């Protein structure tokens, strides 16, 4: 009938902003929100970074373990900045595939957005075969709109935080 | 919005039978289903036994500690039968508190029914205090008339088996 509260789930608050250009030295857009949850097995911790997807089409799922990044470096070096990888699921592998793959690449956490026509709807991860980084997932419609605006070369970065605790039943 | 599957849920299979009097010697109504949940913090394996709810008007809930069953006996002796405690679910105190005291009185099992008004809903139940016998959810509606079926002095026996896996998402 309805299986929810098996386990606590946490959400997250997310702190996105979106670096403008054009408009004035300084502009930011920012949104602060409570969506997005923590997976089941991820450190349950905040982490901040440059979101970065994979490259080229279609390999918005890195479900090819040799799956590309292109990372922003720190000035004068080959040093990455802190980032994080933005991920749509499905594609034929697991959240911890897409989740191992990012710890791999250097990422200090894992985004999953969700699928299409799911809207903002966000589900548990299960992973515990991929614990290293924060893995989070977020609704289809946000990823997407966070996904388009770095294609069009804003470069978008997010502060993840420990949102709150959601179940389990106890009475 | 909506967080189910965060660990897998597994379903039990019941057998229930009734020791209906006066229609011939052997005659028992039973029903098989599946039905019910184990709870998250259950042996998962299976149990069997007569159910015994608590006494008296309305220990239902078996909150109080004190909370006495009556149960049947060996035929010559004072050692119990197998039996499983019948216990509503709400009153102020926790599954584990209910799932504890069956243990401590003897109970192979705690079969815990929802309460009014939720029909054929179950849920997922976490007690992590209290592991050492089966514990299972079942509806409302066939909590109740297993209840009342006893209360009129008819015998009903319960098998309970591992069912099925729901969940977790790992894609
Ligand atoms: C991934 O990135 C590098 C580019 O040199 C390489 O290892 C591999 O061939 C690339 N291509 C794909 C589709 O993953
Ligand atoms: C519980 O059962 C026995 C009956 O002698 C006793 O220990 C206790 O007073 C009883 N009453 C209640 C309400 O639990």
Redesign the interface.
């Known amino acids: 009938?309805?299986?929810?509260?098996?386990?606590?789930?946490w959400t997250a608050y997310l702190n996105v902003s979106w670096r403008v250009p054009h408009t004035g030295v300084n502009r930011t857009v920012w949104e602060l929100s409570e969506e997005g949850?923590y997976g089941?097995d991820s450190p349950l911790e905040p982490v901040a970074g440059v979101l970065v997807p994979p490259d080229g089409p279609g390999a918005l799922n890195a479900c090819n373990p040799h799956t590309n990044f292109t990372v922003p470096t720190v000035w004068g070096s080959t040093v990455q900045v802190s980032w994080l990888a933005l991920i749509q699921?499905?594609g034929?592998?697991?959240?911890?595939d897409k989740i191992h793959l990012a710890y791999e690449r250097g990422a200090s956490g894992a985004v999953i957005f969700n699928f299409p026509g799911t809207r903002?709807?966000?589900?548990?991860?299960?992973?515990p075969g991929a614990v290293d980084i924060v893995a989070i997932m977020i609704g289809n419609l946000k990823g997407t709109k966070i996904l388009q605006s770095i294609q069009r070369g804003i470069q978008v970065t997010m502060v993840i935080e420990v949102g709150k605790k959601?179940?389990?039943?106890?009475?």
Chains 1, 2 share one sequence.
């Open positions: 009938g309805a299986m929810d509260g098996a386990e606590a789930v949850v089941q699921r499905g034929g592998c697991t959240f911890a903002n709807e966000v589900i548990p991860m299960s992973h959601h179940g389990p039943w106890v009475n």
